[PDB]
Ligand SMILES: CC1=N[C@@H]2[C@@H](O)[C@@H](O)[C@@H](CO)O[C@@H]2S1
């Protein structure tokens with residue numbers, strides 16, 4: 001009987017729990033935020049059919065007022081085989097090691113003996129929820145050595161009388177419409193294809209993404225006696241409006257590197273050759289580039305204006321310009337300024353020498369830190385400044401690598417608040433390769449480089465749509481934190497500064513103490529209520 005006893009504990013959801021973690025549930029939220037609870041179990045014998053059910057979470061003053069809970073998810077583990085090459089001091093464990101990341105959507109799971117297993121409870125709290133203290137329990141059941149085991153864990157959610165609606169922060173995660181590794185494989189233009197696209201869009205909006213990257217070149221068809229048909233593009237845009245993302249439309253890149261890292265940029269064009277529309281890359285100063293873009297850009301602008309989408313749209317030229325290919329970059333910009341002067345231009349950038357050439361700057365975080373005075377000047381001049389993270393930066397900078405503390409994902413949006421950057425970009429929503437992302441966590445990059453685990457995807461392939469990671473959850477939470485700090489700063493700018501300054505000490509230095517963070521959150525909620 002002793003060996004059948006289930007050990008149960010609760011762990012803050014900002015703390016990652018390993019299979020061999022040592023034993024150690026209240027959530028404090030605004031109306032409109034998501035509450036998360038992490039319940040952890042272990043047993044000296046194997047468990048079959050582990051299951052959890054959330055009971056009614058009811059208000060003490062009125063048992064009729066209930067919160068609605070999402071289906072319970074189990075934390076999944078992935079093997080991180082190779083490390084961040086320049087790791088942070090606070091790296092959670094040294095690879096190789098198994099890390100918690102995916103949120104699985106299984107009704108029941110098995111657990112091997114003496115393996116710690118986290119259970120993840122999500123409660124989305126609508127804005128019209130009555131403030132108060134909601135209480136209930138989670139019922140955990142399963143089978144051990146034949147016999148049914150069952151236990152109830154008490155939980156509480158305090159809903160503060162402060163409404164967090166849409167966050168004013170702009171957030172994009174670049175997305176690839178693909179069904180790799182899923183149990184479905186829809187063909188383009190099938191009903192299931194459009195249904196899966198809608199499911200991704202809903203996932204993105206439920207995590208406070210409000211920008212989507214959509215290519216006006218690859219989602220159009222061309223006839224060239226030029227006529228451009230944007231039907232496919234428009235279907236994408238409609239779906240992302242309907243599911244609550246758009247928001248803003250980020251136009252897919254016109255061009256890219258001709259070869260290696262310092263090579264000149266080329267632009268894609270469409271041409272009639274031997275009766276067929278063909279696509280090729282040309283120099284942006286070429287006559288072929290001029291002929292194409294003189295007709296395509298006005299068609300795009302006219303199309304966006306007619307649909308009421310022009311003021312929501314910004315166009316990418318070519319990714320990550322550097323000093324050594326700045327001239328070819330500037331030649332793309334010149335085409336767009338010439339033939340589409342009304343179009344806003346956005347770019348993830350390394351070089352800063354682009355004044356007049358772009359409207360929405362998106363420097364890489366360490367480049368922003370290093371050139372902060374330039375970026376603040378661009379803001380005074382009326383430009384928008386965001387930032388991104390990716391394979392870089394590494395070291396002590398915040399990022400969404402699996403090896404990092406979860407607060408480094410969440411505090412990215414505290415960096416946005418402290419330094420006045422009004423949006424955030426990441427390239428890596430779901431960039432799964434041919435190998436399973438559950439078993440091959442370090443994707444191949446340029447030459448001998450690999451991408452650190454966590455960089456290419458924040459969601460995983462489920463049976464028929466995306467599965468969240470814990471990092472996706474932390475990102476959503478930070479985007480809401482930004483809105484709360486912004487609401488406080490409207491009323492009490494000095495109090496908002498003091499609170500953000502407790503966790504963002506510099507661009508590359510933070511306080512990731514979870515107890516401290518929860519204390520700051522509670523002060524923020526108390527001040528606003
Ligand atoms: C905006 C960006 N562009 C690049 C992407 O296409 C990927 O190669 C990524 C790898 O981390 O690095 C940077 S982030």
Ligand SMILES: [Cl-]
Pocket residue numbers: 092093094
């Ligand atoms: Cl270790």
